[PDB]
Amino acid sequence: QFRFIELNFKHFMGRAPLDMAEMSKHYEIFAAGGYDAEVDSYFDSEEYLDVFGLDTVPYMRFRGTYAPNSTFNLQCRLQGGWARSDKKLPMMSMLPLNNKAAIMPHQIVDGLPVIPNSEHPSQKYNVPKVSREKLQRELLIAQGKANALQIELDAAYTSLASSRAFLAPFAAMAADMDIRPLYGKNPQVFAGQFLGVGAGQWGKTGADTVRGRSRRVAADIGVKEFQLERVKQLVVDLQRALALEDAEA
Amino acid sequence: DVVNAAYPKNIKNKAPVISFDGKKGVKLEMVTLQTFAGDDSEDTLFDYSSGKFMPQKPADMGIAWPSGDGRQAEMKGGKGSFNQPDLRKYGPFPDFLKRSMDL
Amino acid sequence: MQDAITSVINAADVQGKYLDANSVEKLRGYFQTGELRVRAAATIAANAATIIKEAVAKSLLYSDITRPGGNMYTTRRYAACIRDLDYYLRYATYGMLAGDPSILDERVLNGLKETYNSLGVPIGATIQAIQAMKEVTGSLVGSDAGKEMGLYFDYICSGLS
Amino acid sequence: MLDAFSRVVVNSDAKAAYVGGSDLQALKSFIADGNKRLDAVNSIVSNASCMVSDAVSGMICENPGLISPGGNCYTNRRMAACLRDGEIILRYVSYALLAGDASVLEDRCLNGLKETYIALGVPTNSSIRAVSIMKAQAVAFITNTATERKMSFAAGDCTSLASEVASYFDRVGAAIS
Amino acid sequence: MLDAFSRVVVNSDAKAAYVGGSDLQALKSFIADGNKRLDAVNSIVSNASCMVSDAVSGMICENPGLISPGGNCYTNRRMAACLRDGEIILRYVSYALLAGDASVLEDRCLNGLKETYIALGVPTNSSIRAVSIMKAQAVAFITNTATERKMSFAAGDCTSLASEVASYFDRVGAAIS
Amino acid sequence: MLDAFSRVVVNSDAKAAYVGGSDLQALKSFIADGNKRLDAVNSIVSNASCMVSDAVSGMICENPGLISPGGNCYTNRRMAACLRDGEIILRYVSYALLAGDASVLEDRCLNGLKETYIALGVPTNSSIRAVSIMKAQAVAFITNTATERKMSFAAGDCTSLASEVASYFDRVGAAIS
Amino acid sequence: MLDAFSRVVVNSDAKAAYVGGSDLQALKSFIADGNKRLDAVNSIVSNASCMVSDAVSGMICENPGLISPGGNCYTNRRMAACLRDGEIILRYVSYALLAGDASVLEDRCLNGLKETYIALGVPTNSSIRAVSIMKAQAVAFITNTATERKMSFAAGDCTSLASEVASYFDRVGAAIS
Amino acid sequence: VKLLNESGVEKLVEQAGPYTVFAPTDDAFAALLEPHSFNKLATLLRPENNDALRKVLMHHVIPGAFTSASLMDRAVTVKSLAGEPISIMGLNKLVTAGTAKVVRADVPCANGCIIHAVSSVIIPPNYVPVPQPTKPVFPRSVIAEIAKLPTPRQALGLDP
Ligand SMILES: *C(=C)C1=C(C)[C@@H](Cc2[nH]c(/C=C3N=C(/C=C4\NC(=O)[C@H](C)[C@H]4CC)C(C)=C\3CCC(=O)O)c(CCC(=O)O)c2C)NC1=O
Ligand SMILES: *C(=C)C1=C(C)[C@@H](Cc2[nH]c(/C=C3N=C(/C=C4\NC(=O)[C@H](C)[C@H]4CC)C(C)=C\3CCC(=O)O)c(CCC(=O)O)c2C)NC1=O
Ligand SMILES: *C(=C)C1=C(C)[C@@H](Cc2[nH]c(/C=C3N=C(/C=C4\NC(=O)[C@H](C)[C@H]4CC)C(C)=C\3CCC(=O)O)c(CCC(=O)O)c2C)NC1=O
Ligand SMILES: *[C@@H](C)[C@H]1/C(=C/C2=NC(=C\c3[nH]c(C[C@H]4NC(=O)C(C=C)=C4C)c(C)c3CCC(=O)O)/C(CCC(=O)O)=C2C)NC(=O)[C@@H]1C
Ligand SMILES: *[C@H](C)[C@H]1/C(=C/C2=NC(=C\c3[nH]c(C[C@H]4NC(=O)C(C=C)=C4C)c(C)c3CCC(=O)O)/C(CCC(=O)O)=C2C)NC(=O)[C@@H]1C
Ligand SMILES: *[C@H](C)[C@H]1/C(=C/C2=NC(=C\c3[nH]c(C[C@H]4NC(=O)C(C=C)=C4C)c(C)c3CCC(=O)O)/C(CCC(=O)O)=C2C)NC(=O)[C@@H]1C
Ligand SMILES: *[C@H](C)[C@H]1/C(=C/C2=NC(=C\c3[nH]c(C[C@H]4NC(=O)C(C=C)=C4C)c(C)c3CCC(=O)O)/C(CCC(=O)O)=C2C)NC(=O)[C@@H]1C
Ligand SMILES: *[C@H](C)[C@H]1/C(=C/C2=NC(=C\c3[nH]c(C[C@H]4NC(=O)C(C=C)=C4C)c(C)c3CCC(=O)O)/C(CCC(=O)O)=C2C)NC(=O)[C@@H]1C
Ligand SMILES: *[C@H](C)[C@H]1/C(=C/C2=NC(=C\c3[nH]c(C[C@H]4NC(=O)C(C=C)=C4C)c(C)c3CCC(=O)O)/C(CCC(=O)O)=C2C)NC(=O)[C@@H]1C
Ligand SMILES: C=CC1=C(C)[C@@H](Cc2[nH]c(/C=C3N=C(/C=C4\NC(=O)[C@H](C)[C@H]4CC)C(C)=C\3CCC(=O)O)c(CCC(=O)O)c2C)NC1=O
Ligand SMILES: C=CC1=C(C)[C@@H](Cc2[nH]c(/C=C3N=C(/C=C4\NC(=O)[C@H](C)[C@H]4CC)C(C)=C\3CCC(=O)O)c(CCC(=O)O)c2C)NC1=O
Ligand SMILES: C=CC1=C(C)[C@@H](Cc2[nH]c(/C=C3N=C(/C=C4\NC(=O)[C@H](C)[C@H]4CC)C(C)=C\3CCC(=O)O)c(CCC(=O)O)c2C)NC1=O
Ligand SMILES: CCC1=C(C)/C(=C/C2=NC(=C\c3[nH]c(/C=C4\NC(=O)[C@H](C)[C@H]4CC)c(C)c3CCC(=O)O)/C(CCC(=O)O)=C2C)NC1=O
């Protein structure tokens, strides 16, 4: 019965339960009139006809705004993977909706549709078939390599905060000076190359052409933090195989 | 070697954990009960490295310098025709660090 | 101080051998890349000041060695850096032409890490200054030429470590 | 959701007690300063479009890797969904400033937000220093000390409303940490 | 009602299988000397962690070369794997003591073990040394003749079940020989 | 003690934030249970001044010939040295519990210990009793099942940390047997 | 025993010289700050009975095995002796801060105290922790930054006398280590 | 040497200045499991607290070359390269550095530097241990705090 109320939000509305209050309403609609009263609660709703209307087949909805945030993680847990059926799966949503069991981040990646470009493309198929003891060792290290990389990214943020306080007596002291250039602003003066910028000198980004003590420690942050992001997914697909090391076990 | 098909993927499942909770029924569970693990292997499945990397230095060739003239350590393939051998030996020396054949 | 074609005239020769097919096989491999190395050393000579200006602004300014108390504070100390980084970009150019890193440890690496510890120069920031300098050098000379010039930068970074 | 008066009822419901006379002394001083609370959320909602563009584009000033290729604020679908998310956080902070209690922020916005951002590939450290620019913007708009826009208020002291909306913003950064 | 155990054990389904009240007296009438036998497995599994950490260590206390560098109870993953294997045989003896048959202990836990321990290089004489300690404990816990502990039981005799738990432990040592 | 985890360096002029070439992967993955481990070493070393006096007097009251004249703990030089060897063993177990491997135990403490005691005439059959009391003492603290002292903790499980520290105490006792 | 005057006597006796004008400036500056030193001892003596109960009980709440049976603060004779040697050590430090040289601290207080505490079986780890709570009080009383008792002193500086009494308690803690 | 290499302090004692290191043998580090000293030092085992680890290791470096023969019944203090004073006291051939109780007398080093082996780890004087990582807690309600603030009519005794 607990699995039957789960799928009716997915098969008919195309989402999860928003919270435990909306899910416990539908056990009272079943308690009043049974199956066909509970089934007609979705098709006779204003949320149905404002989205699907009378003409569209229902689908799993990926909108943007999600008035509980925890219902986004639950709909990716419920509808996850293109080749996955609902036959003989266990019940998934009572313990996320009561904040008992957190949804693991690899179970949301199975629910999301696949983009072409990631920053860190996944090793979902590129993990080798090693044992449970080496794979657990493989996953723990990925979390371990997020912990020392986090506390040297925090040391980079304290150096950015120290670099701005170093120059803040002069950054505000030059903010009420009259700095008039010789060219570049009005078009009646010959500026040459600096009508805009000339011939390839804009850069790959635009912020790399700006010099300064706080721009130079910021590029240290982006090389220290992109690495952290890529390692976060390495503990995701180490964990996810763990789900299939255990779920099939 | 994995000869363990006789121990299948229901391996360390540990059926007989039994909790009586009074005078009432046994209450048999199925808990796997993992160890104080650690699974010690080297060279795991991914890189786990940030750029912060220049650790590589060559091997010590003795007193010469590294990568130092070990044309004694390097291969080579020919000898010549009129080479004739030596009487005294004074056996194998080191790398004669300074001054390579092109001093 | 040996180049490629002069390291094979030690190995084919310190044991007293001749130049067989294997010794000439590597020599032909060096002559094939002879055209690539000169153009690599060409542009590096042109953009010597620009490369060093790009490396320091991309890596070691940004971190309180540049500020007071840091290892690079005074103008004499700052000026010693770009003088110091010029040798790494220059001697790496020599290794890229000679095709053999023997000149680096002969004239750069020996007594180098033992000297920075005396002065108290941070070896950690130095390697970053060379890694960033290696990154911009791959911009100019291209990919494979950057692979060649980059192969001697980390040789300096390895031994200097 | 709860507000400031539903919060004191569920404390009194825990002991099955009536809301008496001594705890009505503090509720009457909440409603006496209720005109400063409406005068404070009006200084945030009036400035709310420039608050999430000073903050998201100030997050890029401290991280150029977001606008590098592959980055999180790189393409136009990804910058639009970050400027969307920065004003959802400003919307639920202003709800809890209006309601007097942070219960609508903790379960409708901040619950499950961290592991949402792991799964999409969002850098959570860049969100913490994005919502901390909006924290410093809000406490400059409450206390009328922004440098480019001054508003016209009556005379007095709104420092307790400034550190109540500051504590709603370091409750966000404790959830995505 | 014995199949619902077996369903949990052999059929790998339902996990707890926790016998209620009216299902209990049908089991006690079905199992001969059931009030002694349900005290017999209660005297084992309430002292389960105390019996393992003797029996793994008492193997090392008589054979000290296993924790030498080069021995098999060196390298802490291998020392913990010996303690899990000592815990598994202690459990699966007690299900054979509960169900009254060595059939479920043989196929699930014991078939192929002799080929397993010679495939990993496990010294198979010391495993008989380890289970002889667990053979010596379980006759002492059932008869309430344990040294530092004594249990409060209903009075009587349990020597017939103590011989029955002697006939389960040597079947392990007859298999891994 | 301070080698038992791996911290991270973030400032300049370090030589390890840039050129160090390695985060310690086997020690970056031991803070992944590290709050549970640091509470477990905090159970022992906040009771180690009571653990060594209970264990040494445990073997005196179980074998009264050691405080006999002619016994090995009669003189005040010998009674002070027997209390010193129990604390030093209990610290190096608490190294190996903290570091997670028994390499530091078998290098500084256990290497050349059986040859020491048979050269000094120290009885080895009584000395392993004093370690095995501390084996039974340390599992009561980590599982928090000690009788006359409990400690406040966070809610959870600490098996296979009491079972880890039982794997070091017999490793002491078999190296001196 | 010696003091701050007779220390530079026996240093000038070693060079066989007279106490000339280059060494009287070490003494005439010492007497010019003589009123500061007498105001520095009076912060200790006026709180001498409550500092020893502040420090021995702080050793107990950090190391609770001393009050367990088998400990070393268990009985009333053992507790009152531990309140005795907290203040006997404080008696000689207050002499050595008054005299200006640690000769009285290293010939009466520390005159074989490490040989005493071994032969008494006193845990030396807990006594280094006591002594040092009295060090952390004395640098708060001399600098008048104790959190709960302020004494009225004329303004100025006592960082020299605070660092002098911090070197007398470390000397005690170096020798009973 | 391993803590120096990780913590970045090892660059400092690479320098040519005449130092007097009081490097503790690892039995001293192994002796850090005192119920007392584990309170104030265990928190450094966390991987983010490299900050205090430099400040506790830098207390062992003394500017100058103080050999034990130079401490013939002399008590002289000095501050470290950490920044806080330490009292080296040599009397009765028992040279002390705070709570050191030096084991091995001296080791001659490269730049005229000396190395003494100590029995324990010297903690700096005004060093407070870093607190454990905690939970950022936020006020459950807003009306439990307006009720927690005394009004002006309360401060004058006009009300209870
Ligand atoms: C790079 C080019 C770049 C930055 C760096 C970053 C600068 C920055 N600014 C703040 C603070 C504010 N932004 C504010 C917003 C506005 N000011 C206005 O008056 C209008 C209404 C509005 C814009 C539409 C405000 C009010 C502040 C507060 C300061 C003040 O008192 O004026 C920060 C926050 C500091 C922190 O991290 O805590 C930063 C870094 N913006 C860039 O574009
Ligand atoms: C003499 C005949 C004799 C003793 C002396 C005494 C020593 C002893 N104690 C145990 C078992 C434990 N000892 C423990 C230690 C302590 N308990 C405390 O509360 C304080 C902190 C500390 C002593 C200062 C603990 C926790 C145990 C475990 C049992 C329990 O929970 O109490 C033994 C071993 C006995 C065994 O393993 O069965 C010995 C020898 N006992 C004596 O008989
Ligand atoms: C137990 C867990 C525990 C304690 C008991 C307590 C003991 C303690 N106190 C300090 C610091 C000081 N102790 C002082 C002593 C006293 N205060 C007084 O004014 C009188 C003389 C006496 C009490 C009768 C003083 C003056 C200080 C300095 C600060 C101040 O202004 O009070 C310590 C050392 C610091 C520390 O490690 O906490 C200890 C152990 N603290 C406990 O944790
Ligand atoms: C702190 C945030 C400010 C500040 C606040 C004050 N506002 C005061 C009075 C006030 N504000 C409003 C308008 C407000 N009420 C509404 O109904 C709406 C929108 C529909 C808004 C924006 C009113 C009506 C009042 C007057 C109430 C009254 O005087 O009775 C005020 C005066 C004292 C008080 O009301 O308690 C203060 C201090 N002023 C500041 O200086 C900072 C910047
Ligand atoms: C053998 C190991 C023991 C022993 C066993 C006996 N127990 C007897 C009666 C009895 N046993 C239990 C516990 C057991 N029965 C249950 O139903 C459950 C679970 C719900 C358990 C754990 C109970 C409750 C009783 C009844 C006691 C009473 O009436 O108060 C018993 C008597 C004969 C019999 O009933 O079979 C024996 C011999 N006694 C021993 O002497 C050894 C050490
Ligand atoms: C311990 C007292 C022994 C000893 C034990 C070791 N066993 C190791 C691995 C292992 N053992 C089993 C059989 C056991 N596990 C089960 O799940 C069940 C039944 C339910 C039983 C009886 C298995 C399946 C395995 C794992 C084999 C595999 O994964 O392929 C082991 C580890 C070997 C290693 O990692 O090098 C040890 C050390 N060895 C001893 O020295 C004493 C005598
Ligand atoms: C007490 C539970 C024992 C016992 C202890 C005695 N040990 C004696 C001397 C001794 N013990 C050790 C080993 C200890 N020192 C270490 O440094 C380490 C590990 C790092 C350990 C485990 C050594 C090296 C020595 C000799 C030097 C010394 O005196 O410390 C001893 C004195 C013997 C004598 O002087 O006649 C005793 C009494 N002996 C016992 O009977 C119980 C079982
Ligand atoms: C308390 C903070 C300690 C601790 C102290 C105990 N001391 C015991 C006896 C005792 N204490 C001293 C120290 C003291 N007396 C002096 O004359 C001097 C300086 C010259 C000092 C520092 C001495 C010498 C003695 C032996 C005296 C005697 O008992 O005749 C004692 C009781 C032992 C007993 O009654 O036999 C205790 C408990 N013990 C602790 O646990 C903390 C660390
Ligand atoms: C095992 C013997 C205990 C037990 C352990 C748990 N501790 C848990 C969390 C926890 N413990 C500490 C203190 C510890 N961490 C440190 O960094 C230091 C010293 C500097 C110490 C002593 C902290 C700070 C935390 C985190 C608090 C929190 O976030 O809740 C814990 C839960 C987390 C986990 O399992 O990983 C457990 C189970 N608890 C027990 O019941 C047994 C007896
Ligand atoms: C209830 C509250 C609530 C929220 C807080 C947001 C949370 C949120 N953000 C995104 C989605 C996203 N969020 C970001 C955000 C960022 N990348 C960055 O550079 C910054 C650090 C950061 C914010 C400025 C991006 C870039 C996406 C789109 C992912 C992509 O297509 O690349 C999604 C997935 C939406 C979808 O695609 O359907 C959700 C649920 N939504 C909510 O309903
Ligand atoms: C949970 C609490 C609990 C215990 C601690 C043990 C205690 C215990 N140990 C043994 C019995 C034993 N116990 C051990 C274990 C050890 N002996 C040694 O040599 C070392 C001191 C130690 C390993 C460290 C051994 C080796 C035997 C004897 C087994 C044999 O007959 O060979 C017996 C059986 C005696 C009898 O049945 O009458 C008992 C009750 N049992 C328990 O129920
Ligand atoms: C018979 C007993 C006896 C004493 C108790 C002292 C009493 C005493 N203290 C000071 C005087 C002083 N005492 C201090 C000391 C301090 N002030 C501070 O702010 C610090 C907290 C603390 C440092 C330890 C200072 C700074 C002076 C004044 C300067 C000086 O005398 O050198 C003076 C000189 C000024 C005066 O006349 O009051 C005297 C007599 N001398 C004695 O003969
Ligand atoms: C105490 C002696 C001393 C000096 C002088 C010093 C200068 C110094 N000037 C710098 C940058 C800079 N300096 C300027 C300066 C100027 N632009 C102009 O148009 C003007 C002509 C001129 C100032 C009057 C600029 C624009 C930068 C940043 C350059 C860049 O970002 O590429 C930097 C790099 C960033 C930093 O760490 O601050 C240093 C170290 N350091 C020292 O230790």
Q: For residue C132, is it left (φ>0), alpha (ψ between -120 and 50) or beta?
A: alpha
By the 8 A CB rule, do F13 and C125 touch?
yes
CA dist., res. G132 & res. G171, Å (int): 11
- DSSP letter at D169 equals H
Strand, coil or helix: H63: strand
Which residues, other chains included, contact C70 with Cβ-Cβ below 8 Å and sequence gap of 6+?
C63, C64, F12, F13
| Main-chain phi, psi angles of B83, to 5 degrees | -70, 130
Angle between helices G34-45 and G124-141 (to 10 degrees): 120
- Ligand 3 contacts (CB < 6 A) are G 47, 50-51, 53-54, 57-58, 61, 133, 136-137, 140, 146-149
Which residues, other chains included, contact F49 with Cβ-Cβ below 8 Å and sequence gap of 6+?
G63, G65, G66, G71, G72, G123, G125, G126, H35
State whether residue F18 sits within 8 Å of chain C by CB: yes
CA dist., res. A103 & res. H32, Å (int): 41
Strands H104-108 and H20-21: unpaired
Question: With the CA atoms of A202, A206, A208 and A210 taken in that order, what torsion angle do they form, in degrees rounded to the nearest 10?
Answer: 90
Instruction: Tell me, in Å, the resolution of the deposited structure.
Output: 3.3
Domain count, chain E: 1
Cβ–Cβ of C62/A162 closer than 8 Å?
A: no
Tokens of A214: 């706080």
CA dist., res. E18 & res. E41, Å (int): 16
Q: Comparing C-alpha atoms, which of G119, G117, G112 is closest to residue G127?
A: G117
What are the C-alpha distances in Å from E113 to residues E97, E107, F65? 20, 10, 47
What are the C-alpha distances in Å from F101 to residues C137, E79, F104, F134, F167? 45, 11, 7, 19, 10
In this complex, which of H34, H85, H89 lies closest to G171 when CB atoms are compared? H89
Give the residue, out of D51, D67, D137, with the most ligand 1 atoms within 8 A of its beta carbon, to mutate for a pocket test. Answer: D137
| Main-chain phi, psi angles of H96, to 5 degrees | -120, 145
Sequence letter at residue B30: M
CB atoms within 10 A of CB E6: 16
By the 8 A CB rule, do H136 and D171 touch?
yes
The secondary structure of B25-94 as a DSSP string is: ---B-------S-----SS-SS----S------PPP-TTS-TT---TTTS------SS----S-------
| Main-chain phi, psi angles of H97, to 5 degrees | -135, 90
Give how far the C-alpha of residue A118 lies from the chain's centroid of Cα atoms, to the nearest Å. 12
Tokens of E169: 């432990």
CA dist., res. D71 & res. A119, Å (int): 7
CA dist., res. B6 & res. A54, Å (int): 57
Tokens of B56: 């590589």
CA distance F77 to chain G (A): 7
By the 8 A CB rule, do B48 and F25 touch?
yes
Q: Which residue of G has its CA nearest to F46?
A: G63
Residues in chain C: 161
Ligand 2 neighbour F137 (Cβ under 6 A) = yes
State whether residue C39 sits within 8 Å of chain B by CB: no
Q: Comparing C-alpha atoms, which of G53, E146, G71 is closest to residue F148?
A: G71
CA dist., res. E138 & res. E134, Å (int): 6
State whether residue H123 sits within 8 Å of chain F by CB: no
Query: Kind and range of the H or E element at F148?
Result: none
Cβ–Cβ of C124/F21 closer than 8 Å?
A: no
What are the C-alpha distances in Å from A70 to residues C116, D49, D119, E67? 55, 26, 13, 50
Which residues, other chains included, contact H147 with Cβ-Cβ below 8 Å and sequence gap of 6+?
D23, D25, D26, D27
Task: Assess whether chains D and G touch, using the rule of 3 or more C-beta pairs within 8 angstroms.
Answer: no
- Ligand 13 contacts (CB < 6 A) are A 211-213; C 57, 61, 66, 73-75, 78
Give how far the C-alpha of residue E116 lies from the chain's centroid of Cα atoms, to the nearest Å. 19
By the 8 A CB rule, do H96 and H88 touch?
yes
* Maximum alpha-carbon separation in chain D: 63
Residue window 13-32, chain B: list those with CB within 8 Å of chain E: 13-18, 20, 24-30
CATH number, domain of D47, equals: 1.10.490.20
Sheet containing H94-97: order of strands: H74-79, H85-91, H94-97
> A153-156: long-range contacts (C-beta < 8 A, 24 or more apart)?
A153/A221, A153/A224, A153/A225, A153/A228, A153/D125, A154/F10, A154/H48, A155/F8, A155/F9, A155/F10, A155/F11, A156/A217, A156/A220, A156/A221, A156/A224, A156/F10
Give how far the C-alpha of residue A223 lies from the chain's centroid of Cα atoms, to the nearest Å. 20
Strands H114-117 and H20-21: parallel
CA dist., res. G142 & res. G44, Å (int): 8
CA dist., res. C120 & res. H81, Å (int): 14
In this complex, which of G70, G118, G123 lies closest to F57 when CB atoms are compared? G70
Strand partners, H104: H117
CA of residue F139 to ligand 2 center, whole Å: 12
Q: What was the experiment behind these coordinates?
A: cryo-EM
10 Å CB burial of residue A51 (0-12, 13-18, 19+) is: middle
Q: Comparing C-alpha atoms, which of G174, G27, G167 is closest to residue G93?
A: G167
Which of H25, H89, H92 best probes binding to G when mutated, by most G CB atoms within 10 angstroms? H89
User: Which residue range is the domain that position D78 belongs to?
Assistant: 1-177
Q: Which residue of B has its CA nearest to A225?
A: B50
Ligand 9 neighbour F156 (Cβ under 6 A) = yes
Tokens of E36: 């002694």
Strand partners, E69: E71
State whether residue C139 sits within 8 Å of chain A by CB: no
CA of residue F146 to ligand 2 center, whole Å: 9
By the 8 A CB rule, do A225 and C67 touch?
no
F158 is in an annotated binding site: yes
In this complex, which of B56, B77, B100 lies closest to C2 when CB atoms are compared? B100
CB atoms within 10 A of CB B33: 15
Cβ–Cβ of E57/F101 closer than 8 Å?
A: no
Strand, coil or helix: H21: strand
By the 8 A CB rule, do F37 and C145 touch?
no
